[PDB]
Amino acid sequence: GSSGSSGLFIKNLNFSTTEETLKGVFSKVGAIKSCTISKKKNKAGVLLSMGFGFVEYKKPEQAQKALKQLQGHTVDGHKLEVRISERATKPASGPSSG
Template sequence: ESKQAAAAQAETARRKIDVESLLASDVQGDDGNDGGNTSTSTLFIKNLNFDTTEATLREVFAPVGQLRKVTIRKKKDPKHPGQFLSMGFGFVEFAGEDTAGRALKSLQGFVVDGHALQLKISSQSSAAGEVSASTMPKASTGTKLIIRNVPFEATRKDIMELFSAYGQLKTVRLPKKYAGGHRGFAFIEFLGQQEAKAAMKHLTNTHLYGRHLVIEPAEDIAD
């Protein structure tokens, strides 16, 4: 146990040094551009190792600036009642937009527990205000997607949490079987075209509960 504790401490120290080195090089190479071009203080993180904890993410992102919240999305462990399993993605909220932009620029691809982090600015907190100010038709072209190969243990909430990182969702439907359970695909609609495009682009190679999601436009779906 003492060896494991020592190894854990060494790994924590290594992460701190690596992050500080990245931040230092970022400052030295700063050309005055904020790099992240953020409009929100929250980052969406995917490709997390299932063993990575929220405490580990705090250690990685804390050197960048003040954190408000770190969340890894989890599901119930069917083999161990009362316990939860990581879904491989999460969110980090900073105290300011500039800090989020710096983290996006400096830590994109940073390796944590053997996995390179994939970071993106989350739109879930800012999309509502942007869309409400526009006049959008009832059926907006390019806002609907169909998600195939959805794992049967996934829920509507899982789909919402994954896709809401890219903007405000208008509808989320997970068609059910007559005998119970869903049919393995889902329909979602964003309030904006750019949000739908971003979701398709960034979630194309995403796995949910071990299954590769297949995402396609779905403009022929009836409301």
């Protein structure tokens, strides 16, 4: 019984994709409060995405819109998975090699 929260979880983020571009695409809906993509220090030591990130908005609404509004958008030839951050259901990340 509570509607209204900030934050957005993204998946399938092309390693090539950057924070700048992400802000632009999301900047269409409204003013972004804070954007941070899951990036770690690799062998080289460069901040590279991990295929997912977290976008924040100034108001719950904006996030509620950009959620699906941005969903389906063909980015880098691949579609991203947008979800309402802070969701009870945990993301099931399957393996790749095998």
